[PDB]
Design a protein around this ligand. Structure first.
Ligand code: HEM
Ligand code: HEM
Ligand SMILES: Nc1ccc2ccc(CNCCCc3cccnc3)cc2n1
Ligand SMILES: Nc1ccc2ccc(CNCCCc3cccnc3)cc2n1
Ligand SMILES: C[C@H](O)[C@H](O)[C@H]1CNc2nc(N)[nH]c(=O)c2N1
Ligand SMILES: C[C@H](O)[C@H](O)[C@H]1CNc2nc(N)[nH]c(=O)c2N1
Ligand SMILES: [Zn+2]
Lengths: 413, 408
């Protein structure tokens, strides 16, 4: 591979040089003859696989704190190697755990909010042993991160995988999501994205309210045991009713959303160690709710209803009634969050901040992996600066990874 | 291996086998994706490429290995020997041009690929000749507003010293003027090309929408200026169906999008001048041409007239103004009976096209970064459609601007 790769911004003519790609550790899915950049997703580590992965990470950590090649660096390598030899695994120091988590975020090529990467509150939950304990840790996370609307990015990290038959898993895809209910007539009540998980909850004993916005219970698996159900205290669940600054009728749609996006189904990989339960949270970009959650056909799908209330001409697509309604919904979402003083960022501000972040990273780090397909917002793409920005996508470690849904792999006891 | 692409909204899964046919590179590697990078002969190289192309041509007319196929390979080989190149049959030229379009991974309009009027201009020898062929193209493709896809193909490259080039990036474009006060009048994208025309003798009206002259290079000679007869140049005054002040913006655009700076590659042969044209998708004008910061950049003026609150980005004043502008463009073209497609209809057609190609061809190379429209991305079906991108030949390729390689 060439030592220097250039990316250009076609709007500003700014040209940046990437050297960080040389540190790429994993496959992208692409080859020299095919690109899989729009593909959504294109038994443990052995002692011998683990050694060089741990060293890679430890070296990186000591290089970051400007103690590379120091006595403490050499001692740490030695202690880690000993631990791998005698136990087939090792334990991260608190400092290394914090470094790894922050860097997994820094390295997340699909994330547009990475300007914030170094301000991440890391909660060490590696002493956790039961689902009740996981529930305690999760509640504390939600309350801290919510902060009465002044949201603070946080991650809570549960014990790493051992043999793979003792995984900690949060079965929820996010800590706070709304139930979806398939009706016998084929219609869906609530959020169609969550139908399968909802059915699992109901089977595990959850009594569903059967509303449009029912917060789902936590389904928590500790140490490989069968998962258990917990209700999040509703006072911990901050919600924002959606209204529009102009259209008084908008509130009559009865929409609302939760303040805290808290993804809970990803795997955090640090130095060859795998943390299969590591829920993390930031705050929303408005389009995630206003475009995707509300306007996706397979989601709440409200464009038509909004369009009808707006008295739009809905017979020709070329009236752009869909686009017109989509903007007003996104205006309402931002307006409702800002009014209730709940942190939210519009797509214009987020993408402008991301460009600045990316430029800083190119300067201080030699690059910034970025997945254009994901970074460009789902509405008004070219009127944001990221649309015009060439990006290079590659996989650095530590990293957040996808993992199979736990109900597909779980051995029921 | 067979590769599956999924639509995450419809759950439809397609299976790609066609990618196994590609031999050209994408720019990506196993470790680095360059999907968002804009741009990532000899007799000895020539014959396998020719053979490859003749083979797929005869395979496409269901006569692979026929007497005709065999004589053709023989003839081509003989010709590459004695002449260092070869000439395509008419049937082959047309097949090659339609397939270059069919294989254009960045084009959302490909459902139309087999409907392409091919104009053979390979007998052309002078810039006046090129001008004649180009006028005929424009008149044919414009068709009084009922636009028809067309391509005009000028002689292929020989030694690199005698290239035919259309210096314009499109046959019809607006001039851009660098003003004393440092602002730009007209289209900033064309400031440089405009300066070259001016230096070559063009007398500029110095307006906001001055149609550029053609600058035509034949057989490696210095380019020559030509004015396209104005009655051939179809234009649309942009107005809004609700905002009666919109017409007062003084906006217009031309109805015919006719890209003239690409290189058509067929069977090893390179056609450095192959202007082609279809019709507009509305966002090309309403989002990119009008609203890019580096183009006409009108959002602020429009938002003003809509009396929007422009102090905070989170009022989405930009998005509101953007939608209204695109409504105006579609409305204006439709009212003037000039062919245009909105991005909803275009992307729907593209999904149907993909479905067709997978069924009959085993796949469809597609560049998501380019296929998804520059506004309202996820409310169009292609946003949710996984796509595989790979390079098939015949193809359209980028080439250097002639003013960076030309000796006068
Ligand atoms: C603090 C404010 C944050 C903002 C505004 C933000 C924004 C976003 C957005 C808009 C996406 C695309 C989401 C989608 O369309 O589904 C995303 C993806 C992602 N974010 Fe961030 N994020 C933030 C914080 C975080 C934090 C704290 C982490 C981890 C520590 C993180 C890690 C990720 C990862 C791994 C993805 C890829 C998700 C996937 O592939 O499904 N983000 N982010
Ligand atoms: C008939 C109606 C057509 C429509 C609606 C259409 C639509 C589009 C659009 C919207 C783009 C993206 C261009 C941009 O954003 O700058 C594109 C790209 C492209 N089109 Fe089509 N197109 C049409 C016809 C054609 C024809 C007739 C040809 C060739 C014979 C063609 C070949 C291409 C190629 C090669 C690209 C990629 C250009 C590049 O890489 O810069 N298209 N098309
Ligand atoms: N505001 C934020 C911050 C961080 C986020 C991290 C992740 C996500 C959502 N990822 C959604 C994946 C959706 C999906 C669907 C089907 C298959 N794979 C993935 C949002 C964030 N938002
Ligand atoms: N409606 C149509 C039909 C066919 C088209 C073919 C091409 C294009 C535009 N190509 C734009 C490339 C712009 C660019 C700028 C800088 C570097 N590389 C490329 C539009 C079409 N529209
Ligand atoms: C097919 C395509 O890869 C898929 O729809 C992607 C496109 N880009 C995205 N970008 C973001 N931020 N989030 C998404 O869910 C997606 N979905
Ligand atoms: C950097 C990025 O590749 C560039 O801005 C691309 C993005 N997608 C595009 N898509 C289309 N249709 N046309 C374009 O000019 C671009 N520009
Ligand atoms: Zn790629």
């Amino acid at each position: 591979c060439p030592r220097f790769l250039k990316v250009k911004n076609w709007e500003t003519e700014v040209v940046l040089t990437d050297t960080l790609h040389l540190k790429s550790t994993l496959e992208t899915g692409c080859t020299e003859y095919i690109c899989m950049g729009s593909i959504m997703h294109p038994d443990v580590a052995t002692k011998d696989q683990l050694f060089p992965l741990a060293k890679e990470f430890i070296d990186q950590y000591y290089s970051s704190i400007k103690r590379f090649g120091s006595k403490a660096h050499m001692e740490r390598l030695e202690e880690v190697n000993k631990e791998i030899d005698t136990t087939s695994t090792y334990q991260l120091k608190d400092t290394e755990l914090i470094y790894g988590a922050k860097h997994a975020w820094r390295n997340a090529s699909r994330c547009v909010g990475r300007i914030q990467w170094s301000k991440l509150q890391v909660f060490d939950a590696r002493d956790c042993t039961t689902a009740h304990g996981m529930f305690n840790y999760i509640c504390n996370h939600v309350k801290y991160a919510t902060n009465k609307g002044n949201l603070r990015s946080a991650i809570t990290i549960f014990p790493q995988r051992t043999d793979g038959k003792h995984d900690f898993r949060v079965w929820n895809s996010q800590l706070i999501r709304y139930a979806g209910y398939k009706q016998p007539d084929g219609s869906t009540l609530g959020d169609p994205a969550n139908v399968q998980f909802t059915e699992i909850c109901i089977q595990q004993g959850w009594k569903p309210p059967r509303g449009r916005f029912d917060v789902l219970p936590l389904l928590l698996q500790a140490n490989g045991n069968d998962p258990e159900l917990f209700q999040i205290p509703p006072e911990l669940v901050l919600e924002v009713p959606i209204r529009h600054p102009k259209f008084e009728w908008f509130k009559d749609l009865g929409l609302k959303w939760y303040g805290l996006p808290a993804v809970s189904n990803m795997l955090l990989e640090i130095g060859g160690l795998e943390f299969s339960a590591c829920p993390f949270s930031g705050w929303y970009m408005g389009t995630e709710i206003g475009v995707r959650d509300y306007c996706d056909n397979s989601r709440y799908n409200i464009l038509e209803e909004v369009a009808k209330k707006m008295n739009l001409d809905m017979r020709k697509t070329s009236s752009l009634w869909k686009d017109q309604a989509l903007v007003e919904i996104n205006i309402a979402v931002l307006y409702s969050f800002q009014s209730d003083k709940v942190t939210i960022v519009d797509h214009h501000s987020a993408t402008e901040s991301f460009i600045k972040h990316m430029e800083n990273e190119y300067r201080c780090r030699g690059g910034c992996p970025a997945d254009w397909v994901w970074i460009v917002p789902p509405m008004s793409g070219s009127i944001t600066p990221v649309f015009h920005q060439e990006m290079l996508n590659y996989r650095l470690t530590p990293s957040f990874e996808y993992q199979p849904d736990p109900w597909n792999t779980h051995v029921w006891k």
